[PDB]
């Protein structure tokens, strides 16, 4: 079938592009957690490290490049171009209690102890908790001027379609990745709290 994972990825990319364009065209990153964007850039770097190694397709290599370039550009806009609007005093999450336990968890709990599997397991675990600095920022201030409704919609459609993908592959193909599913549920629950804080604190 492979329709839910594709539309899920395209919805994920749309969210990334919307945020990058929002920061660029509004000339501000007010309300954005630079630490979460740094974690997302690290997710794509560790997952797509076999970019120039391992050529499979031109859609495959270019899409990996699009995600990396957009994630690095968003980090560039937050910490270099429009750093005057970066609320560092509110982006106070100590990401050491994320990277270090996620790193230890990837060495402990994985499907196979090999450098490529550990690296993939790291990026899976990290992506599930990468939004935490953003969550703690909005919970602290009640604000997210740069976070738009369409940005959150495509993030939510990305999580919903991945959920459909898990169910479809399990029932029709017998496939299930317990690590990816458990981490994906954690990520989806965290995104729902992300959506809950924005609707309750930022909107009204």
């Amino acid at each position, epitope marked *: 079938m492979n329709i839910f994972r594709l539309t899920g*990825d395209l919805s994920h990319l749309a969210a990334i592009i919307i945020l990058l364009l929002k920061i660029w065209k509004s000339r501000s990153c007010a309300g954005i957690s630079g630490k979460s964007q740094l974690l997302f850039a690290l997710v794509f770097t560790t997952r797509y490290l076999d970019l120039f190694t391992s050529f*499979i*397709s031109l859609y*495959n290599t270019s899409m990996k490049l699009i995600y990396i370039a957009c994630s690095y550009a968003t980090v560039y806009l937050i910490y270099m171009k429009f750093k005057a609007t970066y609320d560092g005093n509110h982006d106070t999450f100590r990401v050491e209690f994320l990277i270090v336990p996620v790193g230890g968890l990837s060495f402990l709990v994985n499907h196979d102890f090999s450098p490529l599997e550990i690296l993939w397991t790291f990026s899976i675990y990290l992506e599930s908790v990468a939004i935490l600095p953003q969550l703690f920022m909005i919970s602290k201030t009640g604000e997210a001027e740069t976070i738009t409704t369409h940005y959150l919609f495509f993030l939510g459609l990305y999580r919903a379609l991945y959920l459909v993908n898990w169910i479809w592959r399990y029932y*029709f193909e017998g*496939f299930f990745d317990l690590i990816a599913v458990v981490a994906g549920v954690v990520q989806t629950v965290l995104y729902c709290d992300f959506f809950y804080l924005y609707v309750t604190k930022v909107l009204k």
Partner: nanobody
Amino acid sequence: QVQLVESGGGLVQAGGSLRLSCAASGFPVKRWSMTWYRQAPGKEREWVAAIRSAGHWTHYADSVKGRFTISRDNAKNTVYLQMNSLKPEDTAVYYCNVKDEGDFSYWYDYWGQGTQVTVSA
């Protein structure tokens, strides 16, 4: 990009055993999954057994649990399906399917030609 060849099928008695093999050829990817399907005459295709490129994870359809065994052999680019205590309902054309588990690889999805398995009553 990848060609798959299945062998090991044929005719066997009820209660007999057969081992299918899926030989992979072409250019590999680092993380993949391989699934056995079967399509009995007049029925829809259904998954039978599933395996990944590494780890101890396996999965078997309800109707073949306890009777079938899927296993790996990376030294040969081969995955086996051991089918023990075969019943006439297992008569079908069996297909192996390899999928790239990496991101953005929606069409790295390849199928064998199929092998006939018939179980006499």
